[PDB]
Design an enzyme around this catalytic site. Structure first.
Site, short mmCIF file in Angstrom:
data_model
loop_
_atom_site.label_atom_id
_atom_site.label_comp_id
_atom_site.label_asym_id
_atom_site.label_seq_id
_atom_site.Cartn_x
_atom_site.Cartn_y
_atom_site.Cartn_z
N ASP A 131 0.76 -1.25 0.00
CA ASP A 131 0.00 0.00 0.00
C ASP A 131 0.81 1.33 0.00
O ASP A 131 0.71 2.13 0.95
CB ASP A 131 -1.10 -0.02 1.07
CG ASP A 131 -2.21 1.02 0.78
OD1 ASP A 131 -2.33 1.44 -0.40
OD2 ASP A 131 -2.94 1.42 1.72
N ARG A 135 -2.82 8.45 0.87
CA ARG A 135 -3.63 8.34 2.08
C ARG A 135 -3.06 7.34 3.10
O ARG A 135 -3.55 7.29 4.20
CB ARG A 135 -5.09 7.96 1.78
CG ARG A 135 -5.32 7.06 0.59
CD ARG A 135 -6.17 5.85 0.96
NE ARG A 135 -5.60 4.59 0.45
CZ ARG A 135 -5.26 4.39 -0.82
NH1 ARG A 135 -5.43 5.35 -1.72
NH2 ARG A 135 -4.77 3.22 -1.20
N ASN A 136 -2.03 6.57 2.75
CA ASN A 136 -1.41 5.63 3.68
C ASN A 136 -0.01 6.07 4.04
O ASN A 136 0.81 5.26 4.47
CB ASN A 136 -1.35 4.25 3.04
CG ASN A 136 -0.96 3.14 4.02
OD1 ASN A 136 -0.28 2.19 3.66
ND2 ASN A 136 -1.40 3.26 5.26
N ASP A 149 2.62 1.16 7.19
CA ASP A 149 2.52 0.16 8.29
C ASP A 149 1.12 -0.31 8.02
O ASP A 149 0.16 0.18 8.58
CB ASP A 149 2.58 0.77 9.71
CG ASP A 149 1.48 0.25 10.67
OD1 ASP A 149 1.42 -0.97 10.91
OD2 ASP A 149 0.62 1.05 11.14
C1 LIG Z 1 -6.78 8.19 10.96
N1 LIG Z 1 -6.37 6.92 10.47
C2 LIG Z 1 -5.20 6.82 9.64
C3 LIG Z 1 -5.36 6.95 8.18
C4 LIG Z 1 -4.29 6.90 7.31
C5 LIG Z 1 -3.06 6.74 7.84
C6 LIG Z 1 -2.84 6.64 9.23
C7 LIG Z 1 -3.93 6.64 10.17
C8 LIG Z 1 -3.80 6.48 11.63
N2 LIG Z 1 -2.39 5.93 11.84
C9 LIG Z 1 -1.43 6.93 12.24
N3 LIG Z 1 -1.87 8.19 12.30
C10 LIG Z 1 -0.98 9.15 12.75
N4 LIG Z 1 -1.44 10.36 12.71
C11 LIG Z 1 -2.72 10.69 12.05
C12 LIG Z 1 -3.36 10.02 11.03
C13 LIG Z 1 -4.56 10.49 10.50
C14 LIG Z 1 -5.09 11.66 10.97
C15 LIG Z 1 -4.45 12.34 11.94
C16 LIG Z 1 -3.29 11.89 12.46
C17 LIG Z 1 -5.20 13.64 12.28
C18 LIG Z 1 -6.39 13.56 11.34
O1 LIG Z 1 -7.32 14.45 11.28
N5 LIG Z 1 -6.23 12.36 10.60
N6 LIG Z 1 0.22 9.03 13.29
C19 LIG Z 1 0.72 7.77 13.19
C20 LIG Z 1 -0.14 6.76 12.66
C21 LIG Z 1 0.43 5.40 12.63
F1 LIG Z 1 1.78 5.62 13.10
F2 LIG Z 1 -0.41 4.59 13.28
F3 LIG Z 1 0.47 4.85 11.27
S1 LIG Z 1 -7.28 5.49 10.61
C22 LIG Z 1 -7.88 5.90 12.14
O2 LIG Z 1 -6.49 4.38 10.74
O3 LIG Z 1 -8.18 5.49 9.48
#
Ligand SMILES: CN(c1ccccc1CNc1nc(Nc2ccc3c(c2)CC(=O)N3)ncc1C(F)(F)F)S(C)(=O)=O
Length: 261
Positions: A131, A135-136, A149
């Site tokens: 991926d 968006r990832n 990840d």
């Molecule tokens: C939001 N989501 C998401 C979407 C795409 C990529 C990453 C994620 C969440 N994962 C991470 N997200 C972050 N930060 C982050 C991300 C998405 C947003 C925000 C912060 C603020 C916001 O509005 N969206 N920091 C580290 C990670 C880590 F390290 F886990 F990969 S979800 C919940 O899984 O759909």
């Protein structure tokens, strides 16, 4: 080893493929606070989904790279939790859309360059990323993005992002990752535009067979779109290896900071 007590959830980040991700805080053992993201597993179908979750965990435990999401720790227990560093800026696809006017192509290339080195690294350790998409990818800072990840390895399918071989014979090699990666370069350079948004999944192969490809993007130089063009060669053996893209992009970019008055 980190324990559930050391983590304090605060809100719901969203719903990952495996189940809610939560923003929280993690206190050290020196007593220090670290914003964090906690990956969890839905109501995960039996073995299948949990196994896929564990598989990801295990790989992440091992990886280490400035442009890959920082794994902080794992709570193997129940429910199991994966603690990653939080990156407040969020997804690149959206940071791209909301900053078109501010971003200088020298930056869009810098991003691509760091994603590439992340791939070269992954290639070295026998891993693949299923991926590599905007968006990832996370924005750590303005001068720093961190890859996924999730799709990390070695359904819903980014057909629009997959090599022909990846489609016909579900073969996911490092050469098909080279293809997928160039599609991600396009995406950056095109400020979050969805590849082949005009087509429906069921007709991508057809298109590429004819030898049709994604258009040069406005801000993309010609050296770069040409480099992208080789990663889309129908013949796998023909596309560049990561080690090579990291050299070329490393050039197109130090040149880009040259062309910068
Ligand atoms: C939001 N989501 C998401 C979407 C795409 C990529 C990453 C994620 C969440 N994962 C991470 N997200 C972050 N930060 C982050 C991300 C998405 C947003 C925000 C912060 C603020 C916001 O509005 N969206 N920091 C580290 C990670 C880590 F390290 F886990 F990969 S979800 C919940 O899984 O759909």
């Amino acid at each position: 080893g980190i324990a559930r007590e050391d983590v304090v959830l605060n809100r719901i980040l969203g719903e990952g493929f495996f189940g809610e991700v939560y923003e929280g805080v993690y206190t050290n053992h020196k007593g220090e606070k670290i914003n964090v993201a906690v990956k969890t597993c839905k109501k995960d179908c039996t073995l299948d989904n949990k196994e896929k979750f564990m598989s990801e965990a295990v790989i992440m435990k091992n990886l280490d790279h400035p442009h890959i999401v920082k794994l902080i720790g794992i709570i193997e227990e129940e429910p199991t939790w994966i603690i990653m560093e939080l990156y407040p800026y969020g997804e690149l696809g959206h940071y791209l859309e909301r900053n078109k006017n501010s971003l200088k192509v020298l930056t869009l290339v810098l991003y691509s360059l760091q994603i590439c080195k992340a791939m070269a690294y992954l290639e070295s350790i026998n891993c693949v990323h299923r991926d590599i998409a905007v968006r990832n990818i996370l924005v750590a800072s303005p001068e720093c993005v961190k890859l996924g990840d999730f799709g990390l390895s070695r359904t819903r399918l980014p057909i629009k992002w997959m090599s022909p071989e990846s489609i016909n014979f579900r073969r996911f090699t490092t050469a098909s990752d080279v293809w997928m990666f160039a599609v991600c370069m396009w995406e950056i350079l095109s400020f979050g535009k969805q590849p082949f948004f005009w087509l429906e999944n069921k007709d991508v192969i057809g298109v590429l067979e004819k030898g049709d490809r994604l258009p040069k993007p406005d801000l993309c130089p010609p050296v770069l779109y040409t480099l992208m063009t080789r990663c889309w060669d129908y013949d796998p053996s023909d596309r560049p290896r990561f080690t090579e893209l990291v050299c070329s992009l490393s050039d197109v970019y130090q040149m880009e900071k040259d062309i910068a008055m």
